[PDB]
From a paper:
Neurexins are presynaptic, cell‐adhesion molecules that specify the functional properties of synapses via interactions with trans‐synaptic ligands. Neurexophilins are a family of secreted, neuropeptide‐like glycoproteins originally discovered as α‐neurexin ligands and later found to bind to the [name] domain of α‐neurexins (Petrenko et al, 1996; Missler et al, 1998; in the following we often refer to α‐neurexins simply as neurexins or Nrxns). Here, we determined high‐resolution structures of the complex of neurexophilin‐1 and the second laminin/neurexin/sex‐hormone‐binding globulin domain ([name]) of neurexin‐1 and examined how alternative splicing at splice site #2 (SS2) regulates the complex. Our data reveal a unique, extensive, neurexophilin–neurexin binding interface that extends the jelly‐roll β‐sandwich of [name] of neurexin‐1 into neurexophilin‐1.
Author numbering:
A (entry chain B): 119 to 180, 189 to 214, 217 to 261
B (entry chain A): 280 to 378, 383 to 386, 394 to 484
Write the structure that this text describes.
Amino acid sequence: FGWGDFHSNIKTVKLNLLITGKIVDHGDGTFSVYFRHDSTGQGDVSVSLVPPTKIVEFDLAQSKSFNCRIEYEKVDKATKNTLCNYDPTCYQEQTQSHVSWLCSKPFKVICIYISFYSTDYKLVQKVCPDYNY
Amino acid sequence: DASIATFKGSEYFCYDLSQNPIQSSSDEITLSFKTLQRNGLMLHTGKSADYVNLALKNGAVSLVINLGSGAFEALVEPVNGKFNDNAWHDVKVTRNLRQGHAMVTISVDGILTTTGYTQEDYTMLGSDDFFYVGGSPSTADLPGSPVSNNFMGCLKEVVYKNNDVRLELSRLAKQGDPKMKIHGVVAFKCAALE
């Protein structure tokens, strides 16, 4: 595949995001991509597999050509709600996700797409580790 | 003091890298910008496999880079705001291929992202192509460049460094170097963009 053990950290004082990705070749013409991510703070995060043609852009929104699809996803979110004491609502969110992608092997140029929307900054990034292949 | 330049949309610096080609396993680019314009190229280096393109795109900082066998693109922006707010913003981009392991970091003000992955096969960073700051020739085919506008605003302390050399491009422009060429005329200060 030309790469493995993907990791990414996106950090502001309002939100910290930690991602890992792992590839498992099943030896049957398919392979899995597993993502785990954990975030603490305020904001929305997402990680996904996308084709190289995916345009990097900000987006308020949350098959046949692309041969990777989610087969399993598990998300656990814990929210502590308290009164802001700079002004008596402040909250802290702890999120832990696990997603299993299943890809069909006749194609392999795949990219990782990460979005990060906090209360101070927002960021989208596309990583194509073997693009030049 | 600080090395600064004001670009008015028809100017740019061009540092020649042909004679002394840069080659290194890691590099780092830093600069500060101030601008009111939504779109404009801040710097580009690499007319080959490897390259770094740093620009403002619709008020956001856009980074497009080649990373050995891979490519990386990021778009960064404040919430309820844009970076073309006539205030200084600090940018830092680091790339590392040390083990193989690829690692890219970009920070703009108060947001930092570090991304990496194990990559067995491994090349070099740099290029023998020119280094463009504040703009580029109209007929130049610059890979990985999403914008075509030259910069309109202030660039400060533009610096490129790797394991061998540290190029103070803004200062070299302000002072002069045989490898540094300027298209047009710029004042080496930050004029009132407003």
